[PDB]
Amino acid sequence: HWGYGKHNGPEHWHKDFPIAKGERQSPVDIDTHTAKYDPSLKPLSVSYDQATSLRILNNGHAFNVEFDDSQDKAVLKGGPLDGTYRLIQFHFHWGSLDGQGSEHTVDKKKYAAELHLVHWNTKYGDFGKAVQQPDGLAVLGIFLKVGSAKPGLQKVVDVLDSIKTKGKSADFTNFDPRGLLPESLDYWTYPGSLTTPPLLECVTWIVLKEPISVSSEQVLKFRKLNFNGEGEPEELMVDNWRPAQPLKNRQIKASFK
Numbered sequence: 472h473w474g475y476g477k478h479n480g481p482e483h484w485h486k487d488f489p490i491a492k493g494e495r496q497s498p499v500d501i502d503t504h505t506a507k508y509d510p511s512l513k514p515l516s517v518s519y520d521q522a523t524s525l526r527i528l529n530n531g532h533a534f535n536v537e538f539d540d541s542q543d544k545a546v547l548k549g550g551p552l553d554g555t556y557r558l559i560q561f562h563f564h565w566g567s568l569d570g571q572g573s574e575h576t577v578d579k580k581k582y583a584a585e586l587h588l589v590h591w592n593t594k595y596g597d598f599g600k601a602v603q604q605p606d607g608l609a610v611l612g613i614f615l616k617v618g619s620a621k622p623g624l625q626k627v628v629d630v631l632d633s634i635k636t637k638g639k640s641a642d643f644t645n646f647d648p649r650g651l652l653p654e655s656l657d658y659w660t661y662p663g664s665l666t667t668p669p670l671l672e673c674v675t676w677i678v679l680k681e682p683i684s685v686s687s688e689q690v691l692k693f694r695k696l697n698f699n700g701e702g703e704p705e706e707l708m709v710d711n712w713r714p715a716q717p718l719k720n721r722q723i724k725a726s727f728k
């Protein structure tokens with residue numbers, strides 16, 4: 472099975488998922504001097520007031536916090552998007568050391584972790600149909616740097632003990648994702664893909680310029696999770712990030728100057 476090890480990591484994915492060598496793969500390095508300011512880009516509209524979280528799960532690759540997407544409760548609009556995108560889940564990617572962990576990079580700089588808030592285009596009816604479309608998903612990416620603690624993240628950190636291994640899930644209701652957002656919503660955007668298999672090229676990436684700060688103790692807790700299931704040899708869940716892919720014939724746009 473695919474993973475992040477030496478024998479099943481990113482360099483091997485192309486054997487089972489040939490699209491790994493495709494034309495619009497993610498993540499990428501964001502060269503701040505070549506990105507172009509596009510004044511036609513609208514500000515992002517994040518409406519998370521009615522978000523209903525349901526559960527937190529360790530799927531063997533990361534931990535996901537899932538939301539009820541049966542209605543337009545928590546949605547993302549505006550920016551480079553056309554239509555309404557519903558929040559379905561969020562997860563993180565992190566490193567074994569503070570100097571690595573993020574998937575996207577900024578002028579080759581790596582952050583300690585990267586948060587992905589995944590949304591799907593409602594015009595396609597269901598998430599499964601959305602992933603088969605070029606504009607089916609919108610993922611909001613937020614960088615994490617180590618510094619002061621992020622209070623809104625603590626409730627997540629505190630429940631990780633209950634989902635240490637692959638397959639474990641815990642009820643996780645009434646969590647407000649607004650607590651994870653930076654002050655500014657300035658962003659870069661480009662067309663890309665999922666960063667894990669199936670690596671489908673159905674994502675409009677929206678990467679925020681402003682990183683959020685989390686404490687050393689908060690990120691340390693992420694690193695205590697396991698890739699393995701209960702009863703199996705312990706493999707710490709760290710470095711679950713894909714390296715930067717070629718930009719090819721794509722242009723990264725910025726909402727700011």
Ligand SMILES: CCN[C@H]1C[C@H](C)S(=O)(=O)c2sc(S(N)(=O)=O)cc21
Nearest residue numbers: 532587589610664665666667668669
């Ligand atoms: C572990 C599989 N993860 C996949 C398949 C899921 C069904 S998804 O919600 O389409 C999704 S979103 C991202 S990311 N890292 O580009 O934001 C990866 C994945």
Ligand SMILES: [Zn+2]
Nearest residue numbers: 562564587666
């Ligand atoms: Zn991700």
